[PDB]
Design a protein around this ligand. Structure first.
Ligand SMILES: CCCCCCCCCCCCCCCCCC(=O)OC[C@H](COP(=O)([O-])OCC(O)COP(=O)([O-])OC[C@@H](COC(=O)CCCCCCCCCCCCCCCCC)OC(=O)CCCCCCCCCCCCCCCCC)OC(=O)CCCCCCCCCCCCCCCCC
Ligand SMILES: CCCCCCCCCCCCCCCCCC(=O)OC[C@H](COP(=O)([O-])OCC[N+](C)(C)C)OC(=O)CCCCCCCCCCCCCCCCC
Ligand SMILES: CCCCCCCCCCCCCCCCCC(=O)OC[C@H](COP(=O)(O)OCCN)OC(=O)CCCCCCCCCCCCCCCCC
Ligand SMILES: NC(=O)C1=CN([C@@H]2O[C@H](COP(=O)(O)OP(=O)(O)OC[C@H]3O[C@@H](n4cnc5c(N)ncnc54)[C@H](OP(=O)(O)O)[C@@H]3O)[C@@H](O)[C@H]2O)C=CC1
Ligand SMILES: CCCCCCCCCCC[C@H](O)CC(=O)SCCNC(=O)CCNC(=O)[C@H](O)C(C)(C)COP(=O)(O)O
Ligand SMILES: COC1=C(OC)C(=O)C(CC=C(C)C)=C(C)C1=O
Ligand code: SF4
Ligand SMILES: [Zn+2]
Lengths: 339, 112, 83, 114, 43, 198, 95, 178, 118, 385
């Protein structure tokens, strides 16, 4: 262990040495931020070239962030990453099944091997992240596969926390940017005209802070928390609201999903990071599940942050010079649906 | 007579002896109100009287420039009216008075 | 390992620093290298070790080699001299 | 005692000036949140103004108050004549820093010297 | 004894003043050249 | 041992008396250092009057302001010691007029007497906190736009209380209380033995 | 250097100056490295006699500033003799 | 002694010849052509640049460059931890903590020069009595990561061993001067 | 004309110090003693007020001492006890003055050492 | 008025300058320069550092005239210690002081042209500048930021080949000034860009505290090198290049002349440098020689105390001004009896000059302001300190 000395800011010590395999991610970026702010020792396994992880260097202090070369297929790389970590956090995930990695791999196969080694190593706790409402029978292969994982990893690593976040709201997120980027599309398809798929977003930071707090709290063991949010929404208001802040016309036109799953298939064929995914589409119209579960935010210590509050920052880049100065007050809020 | 003074902004003043005699006599006048034994009155009256006397005595400006220093004659004109302005200012200021206030004790002790 | 037995414990995490990198240490250790040099058998009670090279060496000091049992050692070089 | 007055002869006259500055800031908060594209709420900001104007509510001496507004006025000038960019303004909100608990038990659990 | 010093008798002399050379063709002569070109060119 | 000419220590000394006599309402002390430098000391109220006499007097023209500074002797009731160093291109001599100002007892501004002071007076306010009445535009010059505290005060920590880093979460530079990774080692250097009577 | 004469002539002309005489690039004119060893001179105060420091320590024989006009007929006196006018140069008065 | 630059001694009254010469100067840009000649001239001069990797700009023995800790020929590190190299460092760069080695000798357990803090003044070179810390000739030690720039005793001792031959030659050349 | 204020000059509001370090910092006004190592007394002359010592945790990467307290290395020197007390009151720091303790006069005479009966 | 800031990254802004300009059309009606972008705390750090360990700071205030800057601190500290440098050292400081004014002027004239748009003058002279740094490096070991001029005397004797090499540089340097002389002194384009721009009247220059080439350019005759001769400037002969009218041209012409006059002073210094010691022989002020500290106890004690504790200069205060290439550089050093200073106010020729930009750049275009900053030779290290 490492006795925590310091005042609490950078150049201080908190005693959490933590491997974080998928740090380069949108959620990840945030996880390393708090861990680094707190003063924790963060080992970031990376596969993308050094150029892309530079954004993580200034976070954390000198000799507090260590970057290791790692390959998912190669078991040895995971082995050495967790050699000297006592906390392992797994954020490995993707939306597009890539040529050399299947949803199973990114969600269930890999995240197993990882926790498996972590145990061999003797890491005190492992945090595994799987998408919210993930039935072993859910339509989207992604969600189901993720469900498959949360089970397995429990056998490789017992009492391994399993936070299960909803789609995340944050700058650089998809949930909010995706819809806002429908601008290019003249019309914005919305299955069931964006109805009956009530959704509860959660700010990225809230998720991050929550995750971090898990690392430094004994109360969470085998817990399957669910960071959800401060307000639910029918996809209709969300879509329009977005377009509202973006100040771009909103033209909700219903599109039969059966045909739309096909549109997802189309972009899905794209070689360079398909923008929409068959598995995405389903997910988007996959209704958010209700909140009866080990609570996440608040329960883990952070009060959720309403979407409207920070939406202005996430959607600003999509506006035009004409609306750049416009502020949240000028715009209207969307409506929640306790349903 | 000269084409121009070294200093960029200053401009050649024709009738320089007359301009100086005007300014010098004025100052002497203003000083006449200062308290009788006022230090500024006695000191400046002495300086101004010597300056005039020389200006009255010398009819050649080049030698005049040597006698009361001043570099170019134009500068001496600026210095004299600058002094005339301060003489007016000090009459209002009344600096001939005693010290306004003694320094707080140990105010001027440097080794500290 | 290092000159002073600086060896991170089997559980310390600064060992992560050495992961995928060389922990810089020097094979040539002084404690040993001075030992090799033999005791200088001077024939005067007090001798001086200027440090070798005069100005290019260490401050000059005189050592008392009177103690028959032990040998004088320059607080600077570590060189030893015996009478 | 026996002090010389800086600009305000008494707390009364001084308070007049504070009123003016408050108004100034109150009228300005909205503009800044728009010219700096700050991600804050005008109402929220206006409360902050109140916070600061009261953080120094205890001052009883007239001279201290007068300097306080001089300084306050200077800050406004840096924010209405914009020389202070967002990073500067948002700092007022202490947005990134983690709040420290003041509960004894809390401190005991975390810091050697509270 | 041996310290870095000016050579005996001092060093030689160094030039500091501007040595810009007023080298050019005289103006009248110059005009003629261009004028001549035009005069001939026109013919 | 430096060569010292007493011609100056006599000339300057005399001038000191001359200034004092001419401006007795404000001159408190007038000394010449062993380094042949005069240092008329004036009551803070004499800032305007003493300078003006030196800027515009035939027998003492002190046209340019070399510098305006404020040492801070915390022990001294009047903390700051505003020092104005002036030069006389006519008489090739410099004089220093130094006054005393406490934190909340402002000094007059001399921007009128010398416009050179427009900037230095802003510099003294930013670093030490002395205030100058009638200043055209007094506002921080050297410190950051949002800086809180006057830095050159002897009671201000060197490292200060705030430092800046870029935070990704907020994608903007953000102050945090200073956390230093090797504190300034405060070597004690004074020797317990004095040197001379001085 | 090492320039064909013609290039040099073009150079000298286009520049209007004998640039060859004063080339910027340095060639075998610069002080050779490893100049001889230096035995520097020891200054005064190294005498072994009549060298008492008390007789050569201006550091603290200095005294506290002399004070005039402390708060605790006569002719006018200037800060110093009025300055003497500088004289135009004689090698190159103008330009 | 003063000198007027840009002061026209007198008013040369225009003479046709003078006027023509001037008018020609404005009309046919004569002085502008003068300037072009100067640059054409250098175009023909040999360029002064050096192939940087192949050729190196000359540095004489006192060049401060990169810190190194020397050792006695026998093999005993020179430093005896008097710690005044720490005292005179202007930037607070050198951190030294010491304890009596088993041999009984004085030696530094930790000697850390923070090169990013160091401003390469060369006073440490000056201050050391045994001259254990020296300003080594190498200036090329640019590093990908900030941590590499912080140097402990082992890096400096290793730096000392690598460059000892040249450091000894450099100190040999300049010690009479010091 | 001057105005009257009985309020102890407190200027805590102008100094620009973070709230935490004005209400949790105790400073001690003391005349420094003499390290017994040396017999010189020139460092036991002026009073000094020193802020309370705070955390000095070891740094993980290099082992250097690290401090989060800004007012640590600051020791202000004041010539007299009265002036130092004043600085604490107007700056709002708590103070606990320690009286100067000067060596008491001691009677010495070389003759005693050769006393018939000591 | 279309407020526009000359932001730091822009090359003409010397790296750090945020001139809030009010553009009344292209004509600029007001400038409010926002310096402070390079305030490092140089004068609050010096209070915590001994007199020798604060010397280095003075090489970084104006970073283009290093040694002349460290000749102002060295003269100050020396005054407060009533000690004088040995004769050879004073000539070496005058030799290095004029190499620095040639170095600053090559900096000021060529970078001004870089701003106006002439690019070649910078390259020709900058090669002549590395020739010069070499002289710093060969005498101190640092190309710039030497630390050679010490509070008492200078640090080490000149290497045995430097004065020959300084002669060879000075011998051929004047042609190099002559060459940019032809390329940028009569070009109608330069004259038009520089002549009649930023005229400053004589009394206004004294009132604004300009004190530099800006003072001399308008015809006021003031050089601290002849008026108040510091070091040996009483035994070297030179002509101050007083300009007549004050336009940015007359100021350029003055800067080109001072480079020429400095070659005249450098010549005299090489011709007449005395045999002797380079640092005063008081071990109390200047550190003992390497051989002496390693063979004599009094010298080791003096080396140990000087490096660890300090000179302990006697209590007092002094304002010492030397003619730095930019203008009058002065240090007001207040000293308690302690080895570390109490206050060190660096008067920067530049804090006064930048204040003058608003008055000097009056009725002028956006382009004129680029020339106005260029003709003040402002380095923000000195202004920001
Ligand atoms: C084109 C026709 C040739 C031009 C020519 O020969 O110029 C050099 C030749 C000598 O010029 P220089 O400045 O004295 O040359 C420097 C040394 O003297 C001579 O320089 P050096 O001592 O280094 O001599 C060796 C040099 C000798 O190289 C040459 O002198 C011939 C260069 C031919 C370039 C074509 O060869 C090399 O170093 C390797 C480079 C060879 C040429 C590289 C470029 C070839 C370009 C081919 C496509 C165009 O120019 C003249 O004879 C007068 C030209 C007047 C023009 C008006
Ligand atoms: C072979 C390369 C030759 C390069 C020539 C130019 C560079 C060398 C200059 C040397 C020098 O300093 O002397 C300049 C000289 C220097 O003179 P000056 O400016 O010092 O003063 C002389 C002139 N007075 C005295 C009257 C003021 O300039 C001249 O002699 C006048 C040049 C006039 C140029 C007119 C414009 C260019 C010509 C336009 C018409 C077309 C001509 C042909 C164009 C091309 C056709 C193929
Ligand atoms: C019957 C006719 C008799 C003779 C007539 C001569 C006509 C000359 C034709 C051009 C006239 C240009 C001229 O008059 O000068 C304008 C300007 C210089 O004028 P200026 O000094 O500003 O005068 C101020 C008054 N308002 O001129 C300039 O600013 C020139 C600026 C030039 C910048 C680039 C210069 C390049 C010079 C070298 C190339 C010249 C062209 C050579 C090639 C031509 C084609 C082959
Ligand atoms: N809206 C959301 O973001 C939600 C996310 N989640 C879960 O949170 C986790 C983090 O999400 P997010 O950050 O958006 O995901 P990202 O798409 O940002 O990727 C996360 C990280 O996983 C790494 N990664 C992906 N595939 C592989 C592979 N085959 N081998 C090695 N590394 C890989 C990536 O590294 P690289 O880019 O270098 O390949 C990346 O740094 C995910 O696992 C997801 O299941 C759950 C609910 C909502
Ligand atoms: C969004 C951006 C936030 C920026 C907020 C703003 O700029 C910062 C700022 O308030 S600038 C300092 C204001 N501070 C004063 O102006 C002094 C007040 N002076 C008192 O409070 C007295 O104690 C008094 C006797 C008047 C109490 O009376 P009262 O309680 O005010 O009524
Ligand atoms: C000579 O004066 C100065 C410049 O302008 C020519 C600058 O460009 C700069 C910075 C310029 C760059 C972009 C290297 C500095 C620091 C400077 O001092
Ligand atoms: S001075 Fe030389 S010897 Fe003394 S400690 Fe520093 S390095 Fe080791
Ligand atoms: Zn030895």
């Amino acid at each position: 262990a490492v006795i925590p000395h310091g005042k609490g800011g950078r150049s201080s010590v908190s005693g959490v040495v933590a491997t974080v395999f998928g740090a380069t991610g949108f959620l990840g970026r945030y996880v390393v931020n708090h861990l680094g702010r707190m003063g924790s020792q963060v080992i970031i396994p990376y596969r993308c070239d050094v150029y892309d992880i530079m954004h993580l260097r200034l976070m954390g202090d000198l000799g507090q962030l260590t970057f290791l070369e790692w390959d998912a297929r190669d078991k040895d790389s995971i082995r050495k990453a967790v050699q000297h970590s006592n906390v392992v956090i797994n954020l490995i995930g993707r939306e597009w099944e890539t040529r050399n990695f299947d949803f199973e791999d990114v969600f269930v196969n890999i995240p197993r091997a990882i926790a498996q080694a972590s145990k061999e190593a003797g890491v005190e706790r492992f945090i595994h992240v799987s998408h919210l409402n993930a039935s072993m029978k859910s339509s989207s292969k992604s969600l189901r596969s993720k469900a498959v994982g949360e089970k397995e990893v429990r056998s490789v690593f017992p009492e391994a926390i399993i936070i299960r976040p909803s789609d995340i709201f944050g700058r650089e997120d998809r949930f909010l940017n995706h819809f806002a980027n429908y601008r290019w599309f003249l019309a914005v398809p919305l299955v069931s005209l964006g109805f009956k798929t009530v959704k509860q977003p959660v700010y990225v930071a809230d998720v991050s802070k929550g995750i971090v707090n898990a690392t430094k709290d004994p109360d969470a063991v085998g817990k399957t928390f669910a960071f959800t949010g401060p307000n639910r929404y029918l996809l209709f208001h969300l879509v329009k609201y977005i377009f509202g802040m973006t100040h771009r016309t909103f033209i909700p036109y219903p599109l039969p999903l059966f045909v739309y799953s096909w549109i997802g298939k189309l972009f899905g064929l794209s070689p360079f990071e398909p923008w929409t995914t068959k598995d995405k589409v389903e997910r988007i119209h996959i209704s958010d599940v209700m909140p009866t579960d080990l609570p996440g935010l608040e329960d883990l210590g952070v009060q959720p942050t309403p979407l409207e509050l920070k939406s202005i920052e996430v959607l600003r880049r999509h506006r035009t010079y004409r609306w750049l100065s416009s502020e949240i007050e000028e715009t209207k809020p969307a409506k929640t649906v306790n349903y | 007579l000269k084409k121009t003074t070294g200093l960029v902004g200053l401009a050649v003043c024709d009738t320089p002896h007359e301009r100086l005699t005007i300014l010098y006599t004025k100052t002497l006048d203003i000083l006449k109100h200062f308290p009788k034994h006022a230090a500024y009155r006695k000191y400046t009256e002495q300086i101004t009287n010597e300056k005039l006397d020389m200006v009255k005595a010398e009819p050649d400006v080049k030698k005049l420039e040597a006698l009361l220093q001043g570099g170019e004659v134009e500068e001496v004109i600026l210095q004299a009216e600058k002094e005339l302005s301060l003489a007016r200012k000090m009459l209002k200021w009344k600096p001939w008075e005693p010290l306004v206030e003694e320094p707080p004790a140990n105010q001027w002790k440097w080794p500290i | 390992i290092t000159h002073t037995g600086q060896v991170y414990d089997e559980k310390d995490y600064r060992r992560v620093r050495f992961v995928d990198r060389q922990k810089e240490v020097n094979e040539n250790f002084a404690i040993d290298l001075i030992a090799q040099q033999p005791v200088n058998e001077v024939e005067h009670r007090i001798i001086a070790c200027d440090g070798g090279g005069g100005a290019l060496g260490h401050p000059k000091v005189y050592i008392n080699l009177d103690k028959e049992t032990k040998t004088g050692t320059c607080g600077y070089c570590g060189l030893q001299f015996k009478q | 005692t026996s002090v010389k007055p800086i600009f305000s002869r008494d707390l009364n006259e001084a308070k007049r000036r504070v009123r003016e500055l408050y108004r100034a800031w109150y009228r300005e908060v909205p503009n800044t949140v728009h010219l700096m594209q700050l991600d804050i709420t005008v109402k929220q900001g206006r409360d902050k103004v109140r916070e600061m104007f009261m953080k120094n509510a205890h001052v009883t001496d007239p001279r201290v108050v007068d300097l306080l507004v001089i300084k306050g006025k200077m800050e406004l000038q840096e924010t209405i004549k914009v020389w202070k960019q967002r990073t500067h303004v948002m700092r007022f909100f202490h947005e990134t820093e983690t709040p420290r608990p003041k509960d004894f038990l809390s401190k005991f659990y975390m810091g050697h010297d509270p | 004894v041996k310290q870095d010093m000016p050579p005996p008798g001092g060093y030689g002399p160094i030039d500091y003043k501007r040595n810009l050379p007023r080298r050019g063709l005289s103006g009248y002569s110059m005009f003629a050249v261009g004028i001549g070109a035009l005069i001939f060119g026109y013919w | 041992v430096r060569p010292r000419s007493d011609v100056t220590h006599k000339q300057l000394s005399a001038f000191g008396e001359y200034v004092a006599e001419i401006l007795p309402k404000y001159v408190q002390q007038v000394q010449v250092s062993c380094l042949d430098e005069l240092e008329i000391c004036i009551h803070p109220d004499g800032v305007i009057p003493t300078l003006t006499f030196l800027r515009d007097h035939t027998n003492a023209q002190f046209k340019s302001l070399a510098d305006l500074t404020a040492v801070d002797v915390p022990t001294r009731q009047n903390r700051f010691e505003i020092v104005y160093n002036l030069l006389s291109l006519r008489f090739n001599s410099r004089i220093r007029v130094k006054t005393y100002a406490d934190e909340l007892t402002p000094i007059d501004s001399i921007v009128s007497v010398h416009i050179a002071a427009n900037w230095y007076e802003r510099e003294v306010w930013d670093m030490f906190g002395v205030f100058f009445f009638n200043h055209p535009d007094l506002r921080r010059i050297l410190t950051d736009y949002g800086f809180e505290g006057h830095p050159f005060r002897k009671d201000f920590p060197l490292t200060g209380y705030v430092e800046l880093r870029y935070d990704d979460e907020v994608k903007r530079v953000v102050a945090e209380p200073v956390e230093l990774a090797q504190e300034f080692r405060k070597f004690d250097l004074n020797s317990p033995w004095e040197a001379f009577p001085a | 250097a090492s320039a064909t004469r013609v290039i040099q002539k073009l150079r000298n002309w286009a520049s209007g100056q004998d640039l060859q005489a004063k080339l910027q690039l340095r060639y075998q004119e610069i002080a050779k490295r490893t100049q001889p060893p230096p035995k520097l001179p020891v200054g005064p105060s190294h005498k072994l006699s009549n060298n008492y420091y008390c007789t050569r320590d201006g550091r603290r024989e200095v005294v506290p500033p002399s004070i005039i006009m402390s708060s605790q007929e006569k002719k006018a006196v200037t800060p110093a003799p009025p300055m003497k006018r500088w004289e135009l140069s004689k090698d190159q008065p103008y330009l | 002694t003063y000198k007027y630059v840009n002061k026209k001694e007198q008013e040369s009254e225009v003479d046709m010849k003078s006027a023509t010469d001037n008018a020609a100067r404005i009309l046919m840009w004569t002085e502008l052509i003068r300037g072009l000649g100067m640059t054409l001239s250098y175009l023909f001069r040999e360029p002064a640049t050096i192939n940087y990797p192949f050729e190196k700009g000359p540095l004489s023995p006192r060049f401060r460059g990169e810190h190194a800790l020397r050792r006695y020929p026998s093999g005993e590190e020179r430093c005896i931890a008097c710690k005044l190299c720490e005292a005179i460092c202007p930037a607070q760069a050198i951190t030294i903590e010491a304890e009596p080695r088993a041999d009984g000798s004085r030696r530094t357990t930790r000697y850390d020069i923070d090169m990013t803090k160091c401003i390469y003044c060369g006073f440490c070179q000056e201050a050391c009595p045994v001259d254990a810390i020296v300003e080594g000739p190498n200036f090329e030690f640019s590093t990908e990561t900030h941590e590499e720039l912080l140097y402990n005793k082992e890096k400096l001792l290793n730096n000392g061993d690598k460059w000892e031959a040249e450091i000894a030659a450099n100190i040999q050349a300049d010690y009479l001067y010091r | 004309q001057l105005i009257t204020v009985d309020e102890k000059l407190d200027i805590t509001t102008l100094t620009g110090v973070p709230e935490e370090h004005i209400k949790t910092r105790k400073v001690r006004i003391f005349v420094p003693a003499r390290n017994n190592m040396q017999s010189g007394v020139n460092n036991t002359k002026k009073w000094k007020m020193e802020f309370d010592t705070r955390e000095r945790w070891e740094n993980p990467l290099m082992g250097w001492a690290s401090t989060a307290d800004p007012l640590s290395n600051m020791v202000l020197t004041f010539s007299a006890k009265e002036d130092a007390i004043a600085f604490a009151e107007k700056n709002g720091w708590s103070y606990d003055v320690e009286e100067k303790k000067v060596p008491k006069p001691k009677s010495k005479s070389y003759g005693a050492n050769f006393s018939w009966n000591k | 008025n279309m407020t526009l800031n000359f932001g730091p990254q822009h090359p003409a802004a010397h790296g750090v300058l945020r001139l809030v300009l009010e553009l009344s059309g292209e004509m600029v009606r007001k400038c409010d320069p926002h310096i402070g972008l390079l305030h490092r705390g140089t004068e609050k750090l010096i209070e915590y550092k001994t007199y020798l360990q604060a010397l280095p700071y003075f090489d970084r205030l104006d970073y283009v005239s290093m040694m002349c800057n460290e000749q102002a601190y060295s003269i100050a500290v020396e005054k407060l210690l009533n000690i004088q440098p040995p004769p050879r050292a004073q000539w070496i400081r005058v030799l290095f002081g004029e190499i620095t004014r040639i170095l600053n002027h090559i900096m000021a004239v060529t970078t001004h042209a870089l701003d106006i748009g002439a690019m070649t003058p910078f390259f020709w002279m900058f090669e002549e500048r590395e020739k010069m740094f070499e002289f710093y490096e060969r005498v101190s070991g640092a190309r710039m930021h030497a630390a050679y001029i010490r509070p008492g005397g200078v640090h080490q004797d000149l290497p045995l080949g430097l004065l020959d090499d300084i002669y060879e540089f000075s011998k051929n340097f004047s042609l190099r000034i002559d060459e940019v002389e032809e390329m940028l002194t009569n070009n109608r384009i330069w004259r038009n860009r520089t002549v009649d721009i930023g005229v400053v009247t004589a009394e206004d220059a004294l009132n604004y505290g300009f004190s530099g080439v800006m003072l001399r350019g308008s015809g006021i005759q003031w050089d601290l090198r002849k008026t108040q001769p510091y070091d040996v400037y009483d035994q070297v002969e030179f002509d101050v290049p007083i300009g007549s009218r004050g336009d940015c041209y007359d100021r350029y012409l003055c800067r080109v002349e001072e480079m020429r006059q400095s070659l005249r002073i450098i010549e005299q210094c090489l011709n007449k440098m005395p045999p002797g010691e380079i640092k005063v022989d008081d071990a109390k002020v200047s550190p003992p020689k390497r051989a002496e500290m390693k063979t004599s106890m009094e010298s080791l004690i003096h080396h140990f105390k000087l490096y660890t504790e300090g000179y302990q200069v006697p209590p007092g205060a002094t304002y010492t001004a030397i003619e730095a290439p930019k203008g009058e550089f002065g240090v007001y050093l207040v000293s308690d009896g302690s080895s570390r200073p109490y206050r060190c106010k660096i008067k920067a020729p530049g804090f006064a000059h930048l204040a003058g930009l608003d008055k000097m750049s009056k009725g002028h275009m956006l382009a004129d302001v680029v020339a106005i900053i260029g003709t003040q030779d402002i380095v923000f290290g000195e202004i920001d300190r």
